[PDB]
Write an enzyme that holds these catalytic residues in place. Structure first.
Site, PDB file in Angstrom:
ATOM      1  N   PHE A 141      18.319  40.204 -74.919  1.00 17.66           N
ATOM      2  CA  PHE A 141      17.485  39.692 -75.999  1.00 17.66           C
ATOM      3  C   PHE A 141      16.035  39.543 -75.555  1.00 17.66           C
ATOM      4  CE2 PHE A 141      15.975  36.654 -79.163  1.00 17.66           C
ATOM      5  CZ  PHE A 141      16.515  37.192 -80.315  1.00 17.66           C
ATOM      6  N   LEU A 157      14.616  43.005 -75.481  1.00 19.46           N
ATOM      7  CA  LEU A 157      14.461  43.367 -76.890  1.00 19.46           C
ATOM      8  C   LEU A 157      13.210  42.740 -77.487  1.00 19.46           C
ATOM      9  CD1 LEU A 157      16.391  44.793 -79.219  1.00 19.46           C
ATOM     10  CD2 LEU A 157      16.676  42.441 -79.925  1.00 19.46           C
ATOM     11  N   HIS A 158      12.919  41.490 -77.112  1.00 17.82           N
ATOM     12  CA  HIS A 158      11.719  40.817 -77.601  1.00 17.82           C
ATOM     13  C   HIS A 158      10.450  41.460 -77.049  1.00 17.82           C
ATOM     14  CE1 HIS A 158       8.410  37.999 -77.382  1.00 17.82           C
ATOM     15  NE2 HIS A 158       8.675  37.733 -76.116  1.00 17.82           N
ATOM     16  N   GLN A 159      10.448  41.813 -75.759  1.00 13.25           N
ATOM     17  CA  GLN A 159       9.285  42.496 -75.193  1.00 13.25           C
ATOM     18  C   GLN A 159       9.113  43.899 -75.773  1.00 13.25           C
ATOM     19  OE1 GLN A 159      11.282  41.310 -71.413  1.00 13.25           O
ATOM     20  NE2 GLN A 159       9.179  41.098 -70.657  1.00 13.25           N
TER      21      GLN A 159
END
Lengths: 187, 293
Positions: free
Chosen positions: A25, A28-30
């Protein structure tokens, strides 16, 4: 969103599933920061609301070209030995829809002490009698641990999957993938 | 003939405590004055260690001693059981050398598996291995640890030469002292993950570090013959081969594939198991421990 990709956490003795999903996650955020945009959604089709578990699966919803570009990016370098990939395919018909929302709490009285004491120039005893210790809210939601890069902070991000609807409406998404009006197809 | 009441094996492949330092990439061959990763405290109060903001490369360093004599116990009551075990290990060595076990050990040295949470998310990791005969260097191996995967045991000529060196050390034909340096590219100002004490972090004097038993646990992650599955990959060699994270144990003693029943069938009853299970038994002997009543 028409296209979905399922990535599955390869079971690991070395790393716990929650930890594996936390770093997935985070990357995924980066990746969503590096691409930007608000049309990029997330879902977790292995929900278990009895024990508030997130399961093992991660379903990313976007177009075909967004998913095919997100395959060949270095946000999957150093991880590809630890998860199994899917195919960007279409959502089958018919499916219900639901949302992906961040639900925080004011479970910390001390932050509200700091806010009410910095905005009003109160004392500690005034902020203590204004807000008691019972303001802490308890949660039964699943969450994934995340770290911060520039100024380092550790917190648990609770994810809540909303009620199942029959139709979806328009709306954006953050760089976490969570819903700001747009819904993800649940299947 | 029965098993002894006391039976103890010293460990082979002794690692040291792996020290952490920081630097910039392409200074990796000049990484002798690299400053160590300091542990600091912040606000509950937590001790965290990060890289400096002008450095992107974490360097970890340890030394490893390969000794030999993996069959001889350090303590044993029975002499008949001791001679039976010694000749059993002798026939194992004469059948095949330590080549498969040293191959897997040089694999675990090749990939930077001793970086547990410092290897995940890293864009590039590289492993430099020095065979140090006298006080100077005698051989250098250069490995891309991202190339060697954590799932499969590959083949490479430099890796085969390193495995032949480790197998020579395990057989008592020579004394092996290796220096292992690893460079991990994480980024500027990111956090590193050293070992944590009984939140406090492990530290040799003004430097973040990893426990030696952590490095030894990563080094013996070679067990690929547990009967439950094999798609997960290797685990560490243990009697009742288990892992702390999943909370589940392979090699359960209801199945006849734990280390103890294999050793009792092999030594006492002369029921020699499969050659992969023989590798597992000898790997648990190289790991050492306290066996018996």
């Amino acid at each position: 969103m028409d296209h979905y990709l399922d990535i599955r956490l390869r079971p690991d003795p070395e790393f716990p599933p929650a930890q594996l999903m936390s770093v997935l996650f985070g990357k995924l955020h980066q990746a969503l920061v590096a691409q930007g945009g608000d049309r990029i959604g997330v879902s977790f089709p292995d929900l278990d609301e009895s024990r508030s578990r997130l399961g093992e699966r991660l379903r990313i919803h976007a177009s075909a070209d967004d998913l095919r570009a997100l395959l060949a990016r270095p946000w999957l370098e150093g991880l590809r030995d630890h998860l199994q990939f899917g195919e960007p395919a279409v959502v089958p018909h018919p499916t219900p829809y639901r949302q992906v929302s961040r639900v925080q709490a004011k479970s910390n009285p001390e932050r509200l002490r700091r806010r009410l004491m910095r905005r009003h120039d109160l004392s500690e005893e005034e902020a203590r009698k204004r807000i008691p210790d019972t303001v802490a809210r308890t949660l039964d939601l699943p969450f994934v641990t995340l770290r911060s890069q520039s100024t380092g902070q550790h917190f648990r991000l609770f994810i809540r999957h909303g009620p199942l609807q029959a139709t979806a409406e328009e709306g954006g998404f953050t760089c976490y993938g969570l819903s700001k009006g747009g819904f993800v197809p649940w299947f | 003939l029965s098993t002894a009441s006391v039976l103890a094996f010293e460990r082979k492949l002794d690692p040291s405590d792996a020290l952490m330092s920081a630097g910039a990439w392409a200074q990796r061959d000049a990484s002798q004055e690299w400053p160590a990763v300091t542990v600091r405290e912040k606000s509950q109060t937590v001790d965290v260690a990060n890289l400096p903001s002008d450095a992107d490369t974490l360097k970890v360093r340890f030394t490893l001693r390969v000794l030999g004599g993996a069959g001889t116990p350090s303590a044993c009551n029975d002499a008949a059981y001791r001679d039976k075990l010694l000749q059993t290990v002798a026939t194992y060595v004469n059948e095949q050398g330590f080549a498969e076990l040293a191959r897997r050990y040089a694999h675990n040295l090749a990939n930077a598996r001793f970086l547990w949470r410092n290897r995940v998310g890293a864009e590039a990791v590289e492993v430099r291995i020095n065979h140090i005969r006298q006080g100077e260097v005698a051989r250098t191996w250069r490995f891309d640890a991202l190339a060697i995967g954590l799932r499969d045991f590959k083949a490479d000529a430099e890796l085969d030469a390193l495995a032949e060196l480790i197998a020579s050390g395990l057989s008592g034909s020579g004394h092996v002292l290796l220096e292992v340096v690893a460079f991990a590219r994480i980024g500027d100002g990111q956090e590193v993950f050293p070992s944590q004490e009984l939140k406090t972090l492990y530290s040799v004097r003004d430097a973040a570090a990893i426990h030696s038993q952590k490095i030894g646990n990563a080094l013996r992650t070679i067990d690929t013959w547990y009967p439950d599955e094999d798609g997960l990959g290797p685990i560490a060699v243990e009697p009742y081969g288990s892992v702390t994270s999943q909370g589940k144990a392979y090699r359960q003693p209801k199945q006849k594939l734990d280390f103890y029943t294999l050793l009792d069938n092999w030594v006492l009853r002369d029921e020699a198991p499969a050659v992969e299970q023989q590798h597992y038994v000898i790997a648990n002997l190289i790991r050492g421990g306290v066996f018996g009543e």
